[PDB]
Amino acid sequence: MVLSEGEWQLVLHVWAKVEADVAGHGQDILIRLFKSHPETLEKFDRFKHLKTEAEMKASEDLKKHGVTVLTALGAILKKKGHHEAELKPLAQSHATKHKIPIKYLEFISEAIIHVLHSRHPGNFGADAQGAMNKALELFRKDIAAKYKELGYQG
C-alpha cells in the first residue's frame, strides 16, 4: 500500500494538533484502549493494577508512557512510509519482550482514530480519517512483516 502526498498531509495536519498537548492525547488514547479492550491492559505489568479510569487519569507514569508511545508513532508518521529504521526496534521489543498481537495493534489504531475523531472534528473529517486509517494500516502491515522476520508474526 502507498499513500499519496495529499493523504500524508491530512495525517500530518491532524498530528500537528495532537502535538499541542501530546500528554493529554496519550492519556485519552491509552484509557480508551484499556476501556474498550480490557485484555490489553493485562500486557502492561507496570499498569495492570489500575482498576478505574480515575486511577488511570491520575497515574503520572501512564501519562509519561502515553507521551513515549505517541512520540514514537509521530516520528513514524513523519517519515511518510520510509519508516524502516524506526520500525526495527519497535517490532523487536513488541514481538519478543512485550508480546503484542497485531490484533492489539488494531485495537490501539481504533482508539487513536476514536480520540482524534472526537477531539479534532476540524481536522479529522471523513477524508482525513481515511488517510490516518491508511497510514495506520501501512504501519501494521509493515510491523506484521517484521514480526514474521523476527519469529513471531503474532
Q: How many Cα atoms are found within 13 Å in the side-chain-facing hemisphere of 104?
A: 17
Q: Is residue 100 a contact point for ligand HEM (CB under 6 A)?
A: yes
In order of 122, 142, 153, the CA distances from 66 in angstroms are 23, 22, 25
Binding mask 68-87 for ligand HEM (x = CB under 6 A): xx--xx--------------
Smallest CA-to-CA distance from 32 within 10, 57, 49 is with 57
To ligand HEM, the closest distance from the beta carbon of 139 in angstroms equals 7
Minimum Å distance from CB 37 to ligand HEM?
8
> Distance between CA 29 and CA 33 in Å, rounded?
6
Smallest gap from residue 88 Cβ to ligand HEM (A)? 11
User: Which amino acid is located at 121 in the chain?
Assistant: P
Residues that bind ligand HEM (CB under 6 A): 40, 43-44, 46, 65, 68-69, 72-73, 90, 93-94, 98, 100, 104-105, 108
